[PDB]
Structure formats: structure tokens, C-alpha cells
Design a protein around this ligand. Structure first.
Ligand SMILES: CC(=O)N[C@H]1[C@@H](OP(=O)(O)OP(=O)(O)OC[C@H]2O[C@@H](n3ccc(=O)[nH]c3=O)[C@H](O)[C@@H]2O)O[C@H](CO)[C@@H](O)[C@@H]1O
Lengths: 85, 272, 85, 271
């Protein structure tokens, strides 16, 4: 438990929640079938689900930084795909 | 009125939340709940770590803030109230937090309930409600110097802004100061209630500084005050100041009172 | 039935997806990681890709295909960066 | 040995995964059909995959030799050495893999799409015969596409992949394209004569059937293919393709190539 790692974990939690919620909201709002991985946005939701399953407390800084940049990437990407009305 | 939402919209999000939270966790015959305390910026995620270890990973973290953006009409609410969106989506997050605590405690999973310790009554009602379901209730709090936590809020904000400008919201100074002011007295109060089998103080580095179980006649009040009011050496805040400047430069936030403070402090710490 | 425009995307997506997925596959096999332990960062990535690769591309709009093109550019960027120890 | 080689265990592992991915949502059938693909590079043989996906209603497995190139255990090390001239070195691997996949998957009798160009009579004949003595019906669907359009296709493909990954990109040699074009009409007639195929089809870029040996058993695929291969393309039709590659080549920063300079003189002759 270094503050450096604790801090990164705090930031990752907030960002991953933001991204997940944008995807969850859109999937729910557009009434998309959660059990259909063929549907692009659902596939993405399922991918985010796997990502969140990990115990971040078992990661090193380099691994945490890697996870962080994962969520920057999905944040960027999710905004791009969700353009329906 | 976009601030409202249907009971179904709630149920759907409640159901997803529950799936997510019970993943890999297991309800037990003798569940524990760990309520958290500490001002914004104090690094309470450190507490989650210790509890994860203590429960061997069989704990569910419940965190109000992770629900705010889950409001069904969230994006329509920022395009209307912008920076001030938090107060409009708190009713949703509150109702969601409570529903989730209710259901998970119905089953009997181990819980971590994130919170600041701004009051005694909220942790009290929580502990009391959980006890009526067979939970042992503990309280784990962060003891962190007021200057370290305040720098923590700043850094958090600027690191978030660097990832996403829309998502980032500054912690207001009051939210930080009120908890710093209330906490020590609130802990002595909670201590006297006897509801908590253990009250613990941890520091930034994860070191347990106090335990009501181990020293049941010493109150947590003084130990916490020593730490909130500890004078922090120039040499101790420097790395944090350096990281803040780095993000602030990147975010083009040079023209703030904060940045000029941080820049002056960093120049005063240079080897003459 | 199908346009050149869309099929040209699919062809590109395929060569790219194979390139990204294989990088991750190579890393996982060569470093002898338990493919069943989704807690491992590199194995969690693989599993997401196994998931993204599991779709019928012939059933997407051109808009959707471009989104999928964009995804595998992300994973390309990300995979290279994360296996870059 | 060393970097170019790989242990049987290493191959074994990658085979297991490949098979695992490929079987996703597929059943084995009792009349398994193998579709062997044909067409010069840049044809857009992906068009065929969609026609076959439709024909088999999703229950078909695509075996594409290219998708294994980067799967060589040591590939990483083989770029720190050979960079853009790496393809040659890994082809041994990818050929072995494909043949083990085609092998194990045909033991179980899944419907198969096998990626090919039709440069040789040897390969499809050898494949078709191997598969028939195993219960497979064997067909051959081939792109019938103007040489200019397919040559432009190779150019576009490379230019798009350069924009994806400036390191992975390597163009198809014009001679490699032009050989399949010179050989294919005659190769299809030789195949026609073997009677190994229940149907040889010619498809244009829009998925439109131009020929079927089953429909027209005494007509050669040869005349019909040559005619499309050689068909001259109007400035009308070639207008967008030129514009698109041109604008992609500015981002890739490739003005100073004979290919780009030849586009300018086609775009100038039509203004
Ligand atoms: C997808 C593919 O393979 N074609 C590639 C091959 O062209 P190429 O013209 O070599 O493609 P072929 O159709 O001849 O097949 C190549 C190899 O794939 C395997 N195979 C193919 C067909 C078949 O029915 N059975 C079979 O086993 C064989 O090992 C064969 O030797 O190299 C070119 C570079 O020069 C690439 O641009 C092509 O993408």
C-alpha cells in the first residue's frame, strides 16, 4: 500500500465508473438486449464487465498505469460509438 | 422534468449494480460491515485495501459517488446544470446506495460503506440497521494531515481533468474543512455508543495508528487531532506539489491562485 | 446484397484484428500465463478480444464497421503499449 | 533452428486456441461443404465470404492463411531483425498451421471457407481431393474483377494499413497481382475439367453471380473471366476510387511515388 498506488486506484475507480455508466445508460435507454453480444454496444458493455472484475489491490504501479490507460481508451472510444439519438 | 426517473429505470440499474457487486463475492453466516471515515482527499481507498486483505477479498465496496452519473438522464443534466449537476443527481445516488445496502445486507455479504464521517447519526443508523440483520459493525478511518488531504483534492481534480474535462469536478473547500472540523469529536462520540466492535485510525502508508479494540479506554479523538494538525515538512509535500504542477501545466491551469502558491513553495525548496 | 465500401472495411478489420489478437496471444503463451486467470492483466485483455472478435461483421452498418475499425486501432495502440515492459 | 523454428508444444498451443476461436457458434454437419476461394489480390474476396455466410446461414468457418503470419512464437524478435521484409521468414509457420487447421476441422466435418488466390492448380486440386475422400462437397467461388480495379484495391489496402500501423504495412508487388491475373482464367478451366467441383462461380464486387458451372456445364469460366478482367473502366466509375486513394496518400505522405503520380495523370486526363 503506497499512496502512489492508492491514488491511482482512486482515479481508476472514478474514471471506470464514468465510462461504464455511459455505456450502461445507453444500453438501458435504447432497450438493447443485454444477452446479445452481437450488438456492438452490448459487446462493449460485456468487455467493460470483464475489466471491472479484477482486484486492483494486487497490481503493481506499471500494471495500474496500464489499467488507467485502458479506461482512458474506453472513455475515448465509448464517446465515439454512442451517437444514436 | 428530467431530474425525475421511473421506478423501472431504477430497477434496471439496481439489477445491474447488484450483478456487478456480488461478482466473486459470497454471503456468509456472520457478515461484517466496515463503515469508512476521513475527509475528502485523505485517501480512503487505503482502507479498502486493508479490509480486502482482512476479508481475503470477500468484501463488497459500496460507494455513493459511483452512482451519480448512472442517473438515466445524466447527459441531459450536465447540458443544463453543468458544474452544478451533483446536487440534482444526489437524490438518485442516495436512493440507489440505500437500496443496494438493503439488498446486500438482506443476503449477508461483507460490506464496505464508503463515507466521510461528517456526522455520527448516519453511521449510527447504518450500524443499528445492519445489527438487526446479524452484522458485526466496525469503523475504519483515515488520519491524514489537513494540508496533505487538501493537496489530495487538488491533485485528484487535476488528474481527472487531464483524463476528462467534463467528468472532473473540484471538491469545494468547505466539503474538506467541515469533515476535518467534525471528525475528531465525532469519533469520540461514536466510541461512547459502543456500537462498533473496533474503531481504527490508519495513516497514508496503511499503518494502523489506533484501535478501540486494543485500547478500549483511550479515545480516538486525540490521536486523530495530532495527525490532522501535524506540521508537514517542506520536504514531505514536495513530490505532491511537483505532480500537481505537472498536471496543471498540461491542463493549462497556470492562471490560478493555486498554481502561484504551488510555484512559490517549490522555488522556496531549491538548494541555494 | 453487399457493398465494396463495407467489404473493404471488413477485410481491413480482419487483418488488423488478427494482428492485435496475435500479439496478445503470443505474450500470454510465451510468458506461460494461466489463460483461466482473468485477474492477470494480459489474460484479461485476451478475453476481451476473444469477446470483440466473436461477432458477425456482415450484419453491421458502415457506420458500425468504422466504429469497429476504431476499436481495433485502440487495442492496437493499447496492446503495443501494455506489452511494452 | 533458433528464431525461425518453434517447438511442437508451441505450435500445439497456438493450434488449440485457433481451433477454439474458430468453432464458436458452429456445428458439424453430415454433408459438409468446402468453399475454396479464388481471385487476384485486391479483388475483394471478402465479398465471397459474405455470399457463403448467407448460403450456409452462418454455419461456416473461415480458414485464412494470413491471420497466422503474426502468430509465430518468435515474431516479435523477427521484426527487430527483418522489419518490413519479415513476411518470407514466417510463411513456413503459417502454411503448417493452416494445413493442421484444415486437417483437424475437416476430421469433424464443419463447413469450410478456405482463403486462396487460384494462382496455382496444384493447391486447390490437392485440397479438393483431400477433402472429398473425407465426405466433403467442394466448390470454388472466384472474384471476376477488372485488373485496374483490383490493382487499385491493392494500392488502397496498403495505404489504409499504413495509416493504421506504419510498421506493419507492406504493399503487394504489382507482379504478384499481375501473375494471378495472367494465370487464373486458364487455371479455372483446368479445374473445370477435373470435375472435382460441383459448382464454380464468378462474382463481381457487388456480390452478383456472373457464372456458375452448375448452371452452365458446357461453358468455360475462362472467356467470361477474361472479359471482366480486361473490361475497360469508365472515368465515371473510376472517379471516386482515384479521389479516395489520392486523399489517403496525402496523410500517409506518399505524393512522391510513381503510383500517386500515375493517379494524377488519370485525374488530369478527366478534368
Ligand atoms: C490468404 C492466402 O493464403 N493467400 C496469401 C498468399 O497468396 P497465395 O497465392 O500463396 O495463396 P494460395 O491460395 O496459393 O495459398 C497459400 C497457402 O495457403 C494454404 N492453402 C491455401 C488454399 C487451400 O485451398 N489450401 C491450403 O492449404 C497452403 O499452405 C498454400 O500453399 O500469399 C500472398 C503473398 O504472396 C498474400 O498476399 C495472400 O494473402
Amino acid at each position: 500500500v503506497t499512496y502512489e498506488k492508492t491514488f491511482e486506484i482512486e482515479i481508476i475507480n472514478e474514471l471506470s465508473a464514468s465510462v461504464y455508466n455511459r455505456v450502461l445508460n445507453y444500453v438501458l435507454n435504447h432497450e438493447l438486449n443485454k444477452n446479445d453480444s452481437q450488438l456492438l454496444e452490448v459487446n462493449l458493455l460485456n468487455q467493460l464487465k470483464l475489466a471491472k472484475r479484477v482486484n486492483l489491490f494486487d497490481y503493481s504501479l506499471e500494471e495500474l498505469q496500464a489499467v488507467h490507460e485502458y479506461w482512458r481508451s474506453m472513455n475515448r472510444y465509448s464517446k465515439q460509438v454512442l451517437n444514436k439519438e | 422534468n428530467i431530474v425525475n426517473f421511473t421506478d423501472k429505470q431504477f430497477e434496471n440499474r439496481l439489477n445491474d449494480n447488484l450483478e456487478e457487486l456480488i461478482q466473486g463475492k459470497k454471503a456468509v453466516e456472520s457478515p461484517t460491515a466496515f463503515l469508512l471515515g476521513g475527509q475528502p482527499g485523505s485517501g480512503k481507498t487505503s482502507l479498502r485495501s486493508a479490509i480486502f486483505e482482512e476479508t481475503q477479498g470477500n468484501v463488497i465496496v459500496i460507494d455513493n459517488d459511483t452512482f451519480k452519473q448512472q442517473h438515466p438522464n445524466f447527459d441531459e443534466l450536465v447540458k443544463l446544470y453543468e458544474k452544478d449537476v451533483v446536487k440534482h443527481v444526489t437524490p438518485y445516488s442516495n436512493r440507489m446506495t440505500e437500496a443496494i445496502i438493503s439488498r446486500l445486507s438482506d443476503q449477508g455479504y461483507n460490506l464496505v460503506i464508503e463515507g466521510t464521517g461528517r456526522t455520527t447519526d448516519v453511521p449510527i443508523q447504518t450500524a443499528t440497521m445492519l445489527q438487526a440483520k446479524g452484522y458485526e459493525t466496525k469503523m475504519y478511518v483515515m488520519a491524514v494531515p489537513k494540508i496533505n488531504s487538501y493537496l489530495g483534492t487538488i491533485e485528484r481534480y487535476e488528474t481527472m481533468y487531464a483524463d476528462d474535462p467534463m467528468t472532473a469536478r473540484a471538491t469545494p473547500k468547505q466539503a474538506h474543512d467541515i469533515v476535518v472540523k467534525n471528525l475528531p469529536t465525532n469519533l469520540e462520540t461514536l466510541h461512547k455508543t459502543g456500537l462498533f466492535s473496533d474503531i481504527r485510525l490508519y495513516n497514508r502508508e496503511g499503518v494502523k495508528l489506533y484501535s478501540s479494540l486494543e485500547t478500549p479506554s483511550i479515545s480516538p479523538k486525540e490521536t486523530l487531532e495530532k495527525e490532522l494538525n501535524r506540521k508537514v515538512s517542506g520536504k514531505e509535500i514536495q513530490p505532491t506539489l511537483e505532480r500537481i504542477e505537472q498536471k496543471m501545466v498540461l491542463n493549462k491551469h497556470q492562471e490560478t491562485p493555486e498554481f502561484k502558491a504551488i510555484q512559490q513553495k517549490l522555488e522556496s525548496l531549491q538548494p541555494p
